[PDB]
Structures are given as structure tokens and as C-alpha cells.
Nucleic acid binder design. Structure first.
Length: 78
DNA sequence: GCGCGTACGTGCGTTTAAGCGGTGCTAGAGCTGTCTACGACCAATTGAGCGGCCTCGGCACCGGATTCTCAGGCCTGGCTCGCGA
């Protein structure tokens, strides 16, 4: 499972009203068997790529350190 | 600046021993007298140490290598990014 796929799965899995933060996504990936320490840069890059592609809409914070949600709209505007 | 989680504040019923009081004791602080050992004072003597002079080598310095560390470029290895089936 690619980093972005696990990120999307965890984000759709969590039911936070305000979104899933960097710490929350790290905890989810760590619970998913992912090394959150050795691959931190990759997690951040995947998050940024998902934000840029419009897959994840950032709700709080700026950059990688904020919180993000699934965009249920861009999934059908391909 | 943000997120987490755990460790500290707040309150309540239970227990526990501090504090007050009283009493009794007797150990030791405190004062007093005797006198004896001990240190101040003072003269005489001499040798210990202070001052100057001399030397010579421990060390400061410089030249010269030898090994160490910091830094960095290049290669190998795997994992990711991405597009289609």
C-alpha cells in the first residue's frame, strides 16, 4: 500500500469534525504498520502531493503541519 | 504553533499525631573560692636565613615531519512516483 493510499484510507477512516492532523495521521500510519520515523519525509511529501492534487483539502494549519480532510467532490471531477 | 496525554490541582471523608496543659525530675549550666602552672618581660648569644652573585640547563622557540579529524564528492542500494492494464 502506497503512502498516499494509506493516508486516504486513514483519513476516510477517522470521523473527526475538523479533520485529521499530522500527528493523527502519524498515529494512524504507525498503527498501520508503517514506520513513522524512518519515512517522515515521505509521509510529508505524500501529504503535500495529495493537497496539491486536490485529493486532501486542508482545513486547519498551513503546509504539512496542519489538518486535512477528504474532498468528496474532486473524486468525480476527473 | 499545534496536538497530545499525564501529571498536578481541588475538594472531601478518615485518621493521625501535633499542641496544650500539667507534673516530676535531676543533669548540668552558672557562680564562687584556691592556688598553681604558665606565659609575659628582659638580658645575652649565635646561627638561620636574607641579599647579592654566578652558573647552566629546563624550557621557550622554531623547523620539520606524522597522524588525526572534518569535510565533502561519488557510488550502491532500495523505495517511490507515476501511467497504463
Amino acid at each position: 500500500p502506497s503512502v498516499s493510499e494509506l493516508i486516504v484510507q486513514a483519513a476516510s477512516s477517522s470521523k473527526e469534525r475538523g479533520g485529521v492532523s499530522l500527528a493523527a495521521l502519524k498515529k494512524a500510519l504507525a498503527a498501520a504498520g508503517y514506520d513513522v520515523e524512518k519515512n517522515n519525509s515521505r509521509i510529508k511529501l505524500g501529504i503535500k502531493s495529495l493537497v496539491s492534487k486536490g485529493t486532501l483539502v486542508q482545513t486547519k494549519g498551513t503546509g504539512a503541519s496542519g489538518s486535512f480532510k477528504l474532498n468528496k467532490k474532486a473524486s468525480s471531477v476527473e
